[PDB]
From a paper:
The cell division control protein 21 (Cdc21), belonging to the MCM (mini-chromosome maintenance) protein family, is one of the proteins invaded by several inteins. The structure of the PabCDC21-1 intein revealed the HINT fold characteristic for inteins from thermophilic organisms.
The PabCDC21-1 intein is inserted at the presumable P-loop ATP/GTP-binding motif; while, the PabCDC21-2 intein locates 27 residues downstream of the PabCDC21-1 intein insertion site. We solved the three-dimensional structure of PabCDC21-1 intein at 1.60-Å resolution by molecular replacement. The presence of N- and C-extein residues due to the active site mutations allowed us to analyze the conformation of the PabCDC21-1 intein by measuring the distance between the N-scissile peptide and the side chain of the +1 residue (Cα atom of Ala). PabCDC21-1 has an improved C2-symmetry interface with the loop regions at the C35 and N35 sites with hydrophobic residues L53, L58, and V60 for the N-terminal, and I121, L124, and V126 for the C-terminal subdomain (the C35 and N35 numbering for the split sites is based on the NpuDnaE intein as described in Aranko et al. (2014a) for convenience). The structure of the PabCDC21-1 intein revealed extensive hydrophobic interactions between the C2-symmetry-related N35 and C35 loops, increasing the subdomain interactions at the elevated temperature optimal for the growth of Pyrococcus abyssi.
Author numbering: -2 to 165
């Protein structure tokens, strides 16, 4: 099953205005369709990209610019989850998409469908990294039949919708 996010999740770029992940991915897919670099998996596609994102270092909690190098487009699952935090962040993800959760001094990863209210996830507040309690998780059936992801070597996350979203 796909670990991925909704089209409209807005990725913070290190060197321009923030952009919907669906736009980033579909442009990369369209170009790779024509130059022979398109990759195919049973439930979707990958294509090369070269963009600058912001990533959290989970050991030091520093935010660093980092490069993302693969764009992923996958069939949406039958159900999706809207995750809302107390600090105001909202994101729509697949049910198995993992989040960094800080629990009793350690960070572990937890699937969206396994999150409970009060679980603290990694976010930005203004310009500060913040561990932010989940407020509610709500299942919905998607209208958009595609979901999206990026690969970020080393870090496996990128800042989007004010959340450090786990990545390929």
């Amino acid at each position: 099953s796909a670990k991925a996010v909704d089209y409209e999740t807005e990725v913070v770029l290190g060197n321009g205005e923030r952009k919907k992940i669906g736009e980033i991915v579909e442009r990369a897919i369209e170009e790779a369709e024509k130059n022979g670099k398109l990759g195919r998996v049973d439930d979707g596609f990958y294509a090369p990209i070269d963009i600058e994102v912001y990533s959290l270092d989970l050991e030091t909690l520093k935010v660093r610019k980092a490069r993302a190098n693969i764009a992923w487009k996958r069939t949406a699952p039958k159900k999706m989850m809207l995750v809302k935090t107390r600090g105001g962040k909202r994101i729509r993800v697949t049910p198995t998409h993992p989040f960094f959760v800080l629990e009793e001094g350690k960070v572990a990863m937890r699937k969206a469908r396994d999150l409970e209210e009060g679980n603290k996830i990694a976010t930005i507040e203004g310009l500060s990294v913040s561990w932010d309690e989940v407020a509610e998780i709500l299942e919905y059936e998607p209208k958009d039949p595609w979901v999206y992801d990026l690969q970020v070597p080393g870090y496996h996350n990128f800042l989007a919708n004010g959340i450090f979203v786990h990545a390929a």
